[PDB]
From a paper:
Here, we show that repeat number variation in predicted bacterial surface proteins is more widespread and we characterize a third rod-like repetitive region in the Streptococcus gordonii protein (Sgo_0707) formed by tandem array of Streptococcal High Identity Repeats in Tandem (SHIRT) domains. The structure of single and tandem SHIRT domains from the streptococcal surface protein Sgo_0707 were determined. We call SasG, Rib, and Sgo_0707 “Periscope Proteins” due to their having variable-length stalk-like regions that define the distance that the N-terminal functional domain projects from the bacterial surface. Taken together, these data are consistent with multiple tandemly arrayed SHIRT domains from Sgo_0707 behaving as an elongated, rod-like particle.
Based on the significant truncation of the N-terminal β-strand (Inset), we hypothesized that shifting the frame of the repeat by seven residues toward the N terminus of Sgo_0707 would complete the fold. Sgo_R3 (residues 621 through 705) and Sgo_R10 (residues 1211 through 1299) based on this new definition were thus expressed and purified. The model confirms that SHIRT has an α/β fold organized around a single α-helix and two distinct β-sheets. We report the 3D structure of a SHIRT domain which, while also containing β-sheets, has a topology with no obvious relationship to the Ig fold.
Residue numbers in the entry: 1214 to 1296
């Protein structure tokens, strides 16, 4: 069975939604995986996004890796906002 790894971004700053400029940095899925394969999340191409109101900074993903075992993988990446 082939599997994939996908990415999701969240805001780490309560009350503040991610803007399109940050969402657009979401990496593409990693494809063609099989059970037994280790995966590492793709880095966002930029880790800092400046806005009129402040800065979004990429903190980290929730995991540094996952080894595929029967399911597709999701890595959740957190951005923090400072005004």
């Amino acid at each position: 069975v082939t599997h994939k790894a996908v990415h999701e971004f969240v805001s780490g700053t309560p009350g503040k939604e991610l803007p399109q400029e940050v969402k657009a940095l979401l990496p593409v899925d990693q494809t063609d995986l099989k059970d037994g394969i280790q995966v590492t999340p793709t880095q966002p191409s930029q880790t800092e996004v400046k806005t009129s109101e402040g800065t979004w900074s990429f903190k980290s993903y929730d995991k540094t890796s996952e080894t595929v075992n029967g399911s597709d993988v999701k890595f959740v990446g957190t951005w923090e906002f400072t005004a």
